[PDB]
């Protein structure tokens, strides 16, 4: 015998970068939602896991191409939504401005062209201090990003509900889900399993604490490219995650003001009631117990005293716990009783004093910025803290600081890998065609 | 007993939804609809008999007409974006009158080749486009305060070339041939074709134009005849001719708006101006409404009456159609319906007036400037269907409530079906 | 016979107009795409296609039309994210560069906010600013025509070789008759999956960086007996040309309007030194001598060359691109102006820079090229002449359009479809 034969079915794969496409759980279908809009491939009978028994397989998360495609999307997906909307260019005029109290929530006024290009009409609009900037000190303020970027405003039509999104691979590929309940970011997965589409990740753009993330299975996990490196980022997961909520008691309502012909933009009308600073409440015992448990986990990879020291500062994008809520973003100090002390080895709650920002520069790309219209009615939300972007800095000092926001996406696509199936097995055998 | 066999080429089908594509006779030059894109040829003698198979379809829940409006609306978007926008023209615009009631010899300040020098200019506008800012000396373009407005390039033209839709290779398009079709339900005579043989994208809101005359018999269509909000569609047999004309000799003039951007405007009235005529053969029209009424009596057993349109705005109340490179808006009620019957060579006329600025699709944030065509233009055409809304006796008012309903008058008789030629049956054979 | 038989894999080919796509090998961005494309596609994959004849012509070709409607799209697709430079179009008041071809203008401009404006000064070349009518007040040349778009400061627009490759299921029949003029039976034909590679350099009177001719001077034209059709000469022993802008120039970031700036010329360091391009006259003179004999036998009468002047300075001058900067040279100061009966040195050409251009012979699309800081010494090969057939025959350099440049390189290719189905009788029948 000893002749070659072919098999048109065989388990074989290779690591291959490939384009992916969307799938969604069909949560409602109004088609102005930034992420879905007209929406993607409709749903599926999602449970599809496969045993894939005792296949020894290894991979590293920090090099996977799937996360990169999820930064090819979003940033390109936002552009597909911001393009039709208005430009705030005509609003970059010297602002006469003052205060509104009977906190830095100012009241500004300016020239503004009416329905005709010729006539002008004074209009008053409020602004938080993080939008205006001093001209060099009183009065004559100006919009922050107008000196480098073409400011545009998100249309009120669209919303930012972080709807779940499922990633599928084109037929002929597969995703090798890893189930080992202490997968330490990189290395062997002794209990791999396949699945045609991934879990329903939520596009939550956190920067210091990962909101609404998936909970780790029955053990605290710590991932990093190189724990021994002094500068590289580190990601921590949690079990029995902790609560965090935020509200703005100010019952604002939006006014619409003219800017030239056709174009209009929306701004704060009046402060119903009185200015009460935005709040966020966190259970003190839960945070202390939670961080205490992580303290032991962080200790057992350095074997020395670990010290929490608050963020570095210098701006508000990096040194603050920025997150989206409803459509009016927050940028929050996250340090008062949240850090600045460590452990030796009441039923109240912690408080975070923090503020609002209209013009947000996002993705750290110079030349583009977006304006979020104010959201009427008092706004409230609740979320789960499910990950910390701690950065390492005798002892060891850990500074809570987030690098590029791709870290968030690597915080839930950790247990996935893309494979290309080529079922064309070759083998010897006894036979020959007769 | 017996075993399974799979027969390829089984004719089973099921309803489906599909992204259809275009085809046409061939025509060059920047025609808006066909463009230099649509597939040519398809001379189609392939009307397969499909002998006596029962099938049912309804034009109302049909998901092909809505696909026709999912584009065309997008088709113009492809052609508006490159062209010059007309926002800078929104300036305090001072008018007195035009003579050598509805045309203004109006003047305004616009910037010359460079943005440092103004230049006094005069440009005509029909009364509809402007709105008095106020007893009146200042004016402005109507849609300035609600929407930005762009200008159609004269290079493109709206002359409707017919377009053929084609099922993707693998589907099939059915067709009903019972000429007395109900409008919904089973059809006793069915056929199939890859591509339909004719549709025209002409836009109309009160009366159809250039449409396919009914198949030898008058037809009546509706979602629900016994209802007061759903639009009735009448499809005429022995169509009645119409002709509208602009007898003026207007001359085009190009004026500038800042650097680069420029547009065309009506320069001067040449000759004696007359109101744009619209003539219809009244001798045919009289008994024409008599015949459709008799069909209406066939469903309601009583006399009927016709009134003017529902009034209000100039979008629901008026015959609106393209003569090509120009938009018409006619009263079409004052001297034209008014009444009914019991049980002389002349032609009836209509008051009509032109509008440069239009609000097509009647949606916020969209508008366009129609570049006037120089000289006289005439367009004889056939009326083939009235659109009637329902208000002892029965009352009707012409004028459809939505322009999408127009397409139902030509794409009613098609339904997309996914031919899936895989079937299972028993047999006596087994693999041996 | 008595029975047909299907023979799969049959060689049969027919003409077909169909799309073509990427090729590249070996950063921020480049105007000719190339930032992400198919790699390498090595060269030696040809089939010599022994001794089968094929007759074709280069003029009714598909690749050139397939291409000119692509490059015109590649550039247009690149300039969308960057500033439309209209706000600069204001009344200029200009003095001379006190360091006649350069002027030093002043204008008001909108600063980082609406109402506060400042006086700014920037340098310009007289070739593209027109007095507004001594006057001494000017404006940008292209303001009454159309918008002008700044070339993005970060991108680069020097040529990169791109191979055209036909989709799978087709072939490209490369002609190998080295003495072929582009019309007739190519008795030595070959087929290639992906073309050899062509360079996107634009020109109007010289074919720069182009593929060299082999053992011949070949003259190509659809009609040598026509006074408006272009003549293309393909050159034996390509000559070398050097071009330079020896001014040590610096760029200044003038701010106009909100958002982004546009880079402009600052101080002319040192003293003005006009640009020049150098040619070895003996090389050129006897290079012209070679072509003087080739076209003579196609007309049987004596010939002359002439200036080709009398135009809008786009086609009449030797317009080309190099080193991120544009050039427009007289190229007939004494360069051609000669007729033929039958020393180590050089001849030099005076040239003009232009800051804004209108390329692809169209209107509605003009662009601004920011200056290149420092000196440049553009050097290139020369391989062809876009001569024009104007007792004796008169010749004048200059093409009729810009597709002629591409038509010089893609003549030895024709896209073709392969039909692997062929029926033929055979003695057998199914068992």
């Amino acid at each position, epitope marked *: 015998g000893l002749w070659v034969t072919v098999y048109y079915g065989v388990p074989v794969w290779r690591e291959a970068k490939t384009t992916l496409f969307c799938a969604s759980d069909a949560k409602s279908y109004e088609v102005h939602n930034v992420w879905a809009t007209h929406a993607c491939v409709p749903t599926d009978p999602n449970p599809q896991e496969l045993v894939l028994e005792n296949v020894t397989e290894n991979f590293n998360m920090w090099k996977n191409d799937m996360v990169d495609q999820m930064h090819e999307d979003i940033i390109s997906l936002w552009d597909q939504s911001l393009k039709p909307c208005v430009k705030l260019t005509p609003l970059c005029v010297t602002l006469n401005c003052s205060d509104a109290k009977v906190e830095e929530i100012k009241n500004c006024s300016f020239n503004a062209t009416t329905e005709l290009r010729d006539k002008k009409r004074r209009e008053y609009a409020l602004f938080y201090r993080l939008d205006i900037v001093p001209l060099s000190n009183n009065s004559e303020y100006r919009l922050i990003n107008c000196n480098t970027s073409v400011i545009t405003q998100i249309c009120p039509k669209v919303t930012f509900d972080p709807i779940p999104i499922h990633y599928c691979a084109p037929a002929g590929y597969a995703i090798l889900k890893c189930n080992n309940k202490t997968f330490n970011g990189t290395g062997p997965c002794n209990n791999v399993s396949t699945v045609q589409c991934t879990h329903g990740i939520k596009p939550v753009v956190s920067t210091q604490l990962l909101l609404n993330g998936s909970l780790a299975e029955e053990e605290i996990i710590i991932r990093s490219e190189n724990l021994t490196d002094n500068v590289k980022t580190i990601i921590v997961h949690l079990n029995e995650s902790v609560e965090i909520t935020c509200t703005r008691p100010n019952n604002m309502t939006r006014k619409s003001v003219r800017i030239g012909p056709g174009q209009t933009f929306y701004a704060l009308g009046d402060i119903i009631g009185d200015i009460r600073q935005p709040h966020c409440n966190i259970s003190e015992i839960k945070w202390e117990k939670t961080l205490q448990r992580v303290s032991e986990k962080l200790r057992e990879h350095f074997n020395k005293t670990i010290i929490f020291n608050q963020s570095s500062g210098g701006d508000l994008e990096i040194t603050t716990h920025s997150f989206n809520c409803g459509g009016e973003f927050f940028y929050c100090n996250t340090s008062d009783l949240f850090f600045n002390k460590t452990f030796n080895e009441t039923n109240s709650t912690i408080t975070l004093p923090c503020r609002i920002k209209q013009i947000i520069n996002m993705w750290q790309e110079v030349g583009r910025a977006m304006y979020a219209p104010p959201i009427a009615g008092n706004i409230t939300c609740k979320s789960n803290i499910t990950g910390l972007l701690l950065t390492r800095d005798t002892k060891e000092t850990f500074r809570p600081g987030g690098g590029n926001m791709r870290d968030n996406w690597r915080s839930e696509l950790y247990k996935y890998k893309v494979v290309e199936v080529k079922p064309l097995g070759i083998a010897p055998t006894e036979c020959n065609r007769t | 007993g017996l075993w399974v066999t799979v027969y390829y080429g089984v004719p089973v089908w099921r309803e489906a939804k599909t992204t259809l594509f275009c085809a046409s006779d061939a025509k060059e030059v920047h025609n808006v609809w066909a463009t230099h894109a649509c597939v040519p040829t398809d001379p189609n003698p392939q009307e397969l008999v499909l002998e006596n198979v029962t099938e049912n379809f309804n034009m109302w829940k049909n998901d092909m007409v809505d696909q026709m409006h999912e584009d065309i609306i997008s088709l113009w978007d492809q052609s508006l974006k490159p062209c010059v926008k007309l926002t800078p023209l929104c300036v305090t615009l001072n008018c007195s009158d035009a003579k050598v009631e509805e045309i203004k010899n109006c003047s305004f300040n616009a910037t010359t080749e460079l943005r440092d020098k103004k230049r006094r200019e005069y440009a005509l506008f029909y009364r509809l486009d402007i709105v008095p800012l106020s007893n009146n000396s200042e004016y402005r373009l109507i849609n300035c305060n609600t929407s930005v407005i762009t200008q159609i390039c004269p290079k493109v033209t709206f002359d409707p070339i017919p377009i053929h839709y084609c099922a993707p290779a693998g589907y099939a398009i059915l067709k009903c041939n019972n000429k007395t079709f109900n409008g919904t339900g089973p059809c006793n005579n069915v056929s199939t074709v890859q591509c339909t043989h004719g549709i025209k994208p002409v836009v109309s809101t009160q009366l159809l134009l250039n449409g396919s005359l009914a198949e030898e018999e008058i037809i009546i269509r509706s979602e629900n005849l016994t209802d007061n909000v759903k639009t009735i569609i009448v499809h005429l047999n022995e169509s009645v001719e119409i002709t509208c004309t602009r007898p003026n000799n207007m001359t085009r003039k190009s004026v500038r708006i800042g650097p680069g951007q420029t547009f065309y405007a009506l320069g001067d009235i040449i000759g004696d101006i007359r109101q744009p005529h619209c003539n219809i053969s009244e001798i045919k029209w009289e008994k024409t409404l008599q015949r459709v009424s008799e069909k209406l009596r066939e469903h309601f057993n009583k006399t009927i009456i016709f009134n003017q349109s529902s009034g209000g705005d100039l979008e629901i109340t008026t015959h609106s159609f393209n003569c090509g490179g120009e938009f018409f808006y006619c009263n079409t009620s004052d001297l034209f319906f008014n009444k009914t019957f019991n049980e002389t060579n002349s032609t009836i006329t209509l008051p009509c007036r032109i509008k440069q600025i239009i609000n097509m699709w009647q949606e916020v944030g969209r508008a366009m400037y129609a570049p006037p065509i120089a000289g006289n233009i005439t367009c004889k055409s056939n009326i083939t269907g009235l659109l009637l809304t329902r208000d002892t006796k029965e009352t009707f008012r012409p004028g459809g409530g939505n322009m999408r309903d127009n397409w139902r008058s030509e794409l009613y008789k098609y339904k997309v079906v996914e031919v899936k030629p895989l079937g299972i049956a028993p047999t006596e054979c087994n693999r041996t | 016979g008595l029975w047909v038989t299907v023979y799969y894999g049959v060689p049969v080919w027919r003409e077909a107009k169909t799309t073509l796509f990427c090729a590249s090998d070996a950063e921020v961005h480049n105007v000719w795409a190339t930032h992400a494309c198919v790699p390498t596609d090595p060269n030696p994959q040809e089939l010599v296609l022994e001794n089968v004849t094929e007759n074709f012509n280069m003029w009714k070709n598909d690749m050139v039309d397939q291409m000119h409607e692509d490059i015109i799209s590649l550039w247009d697709q690149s300039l969308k994210p960057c500033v439309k430079l209209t706000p600069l179009c*204001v009344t200029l008041n200009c003095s001379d560069a006190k360091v006649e071809e350069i002027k030093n203008c002043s204008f008001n401009a909108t600063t980082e906010l609406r109402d506060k404006k400042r006086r700014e000064y920037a340098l310009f070349y007289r070739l593209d600013i027109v007095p507004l009518s001594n006057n001494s007040e000017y404006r940008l040349i292209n303001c009454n025509t159309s918008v002008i778009t700044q070339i993005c400061p970060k991108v680069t627009f020097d040529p990169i070789p791109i191979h055209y490759c036909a989709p799978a299921g087709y072939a490209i029949l490369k002609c190998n008759n080295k003495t072929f003029n582009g019309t007739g039976p190519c008795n030595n034909v070959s087929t290639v999956q992906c073309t050899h590679g062509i360079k996107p350099v634009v020109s109007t009177q010289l074919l720069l960086n182009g593929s060299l001719a082999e053992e011949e001077i070949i003259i190509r034209s659809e009609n040598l007996t026509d006074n408006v059709k272009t003549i293309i000469v393909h050159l034996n022993e390509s000559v070398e040309i050097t071009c330079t802008r020896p001014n040590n120039m610096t760029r200044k970031s003038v701010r106009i309007g909100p958002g982004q700036t546009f880079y402009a010329l600052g101080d002319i360091i040192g003293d003005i030194r006009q640009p020049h391009c150098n040619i070895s006259e003996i090389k050129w003179e006897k290079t012209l001598q070679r072509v003087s004999e080739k076209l003579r036998e196609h007309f049987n009468k004596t010939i002359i060359f002439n200036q080709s002047s009398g135009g809008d300075l786009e086609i009449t001058t030797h317009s080309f691109n190099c080193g991120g900067e544009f050039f427009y040279c007289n190229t007939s100061d004494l360069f051609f102006n000669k007729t033929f009966n039958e020393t180590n040195s050089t001849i030099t050409l005076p040239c003009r820079i232009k800051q804004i251009i209108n390329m692809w012979q169209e209107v509605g699309r003009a662009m601004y090229a920011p200056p290149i800081a420092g000196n440049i010494t553009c050097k290139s090969n020369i391989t062809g002449l876009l001569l024009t057939r104007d007792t004796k025959e008169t010749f004048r350099p200059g093409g009729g359009n810009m597709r002629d440049n591409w038509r010089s390189e893609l003549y030895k290719y024709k896209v073709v479809e392969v039909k692997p189905l062929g029926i033929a009788p055979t003695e057998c029948n199914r068992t």
Partner: antibody
Amino acid sequence: QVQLQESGPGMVKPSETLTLTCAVFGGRVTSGDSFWTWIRQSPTKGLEWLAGISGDADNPTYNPSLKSRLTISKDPSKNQVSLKVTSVTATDTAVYYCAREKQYYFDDYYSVESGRVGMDSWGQGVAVIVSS
Amino acid sequence: DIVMTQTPISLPVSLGESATISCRSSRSLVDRQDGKTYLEWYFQKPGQSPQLLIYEVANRASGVPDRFRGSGSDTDFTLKISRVEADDVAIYYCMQSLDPPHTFGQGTKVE
């Protein structure tokens, strides 16, 4: 800015018609941003405004008190503006000026501001005496 | 036609002092017109032609110093010199520029 200069006879006979000229340096007479005008400095009454014309080609307007006897025009061919005084009286003896009332018009897409800066630049002034 | 009154007609002063000049309108002035208060001031040394000082009530001419400043109500208009000096000796003219013909006042002679 515009350097400017008046020129014309300074000695005039009574009751005759006088023509005065002013040549523009560094600009155009017809450009719309300017509004040329002439002013006289009398000894008793002082300064007074006579006429001005620019922009809309034929756009003259004269003081009602002296509306009867004035005429003014311009030509880019020589780039000057000339004023004609018909039937001069002895009281008209005074220094006459030519002045450029400056306008402007900037269109930055969104807003089209427009106005004037008064009479920016004045000529040297030409003295005319009515005597014989 | 519309006449401007002026006070003072003359004012002697030494170096370092501040001076105030006023002129009043007759026909309303700043009558809307979608414009603004079109009032202007001019000064003239002996022998030389008049030159611009202020326009639109409170805007200084090209490159002139802060030695002076103007203000005015709907119909009342005033001019003040912050600190007089030697070269300030001249005749100051109140000029309105609302409607044609423009009308000056009969000077304000300050020494």
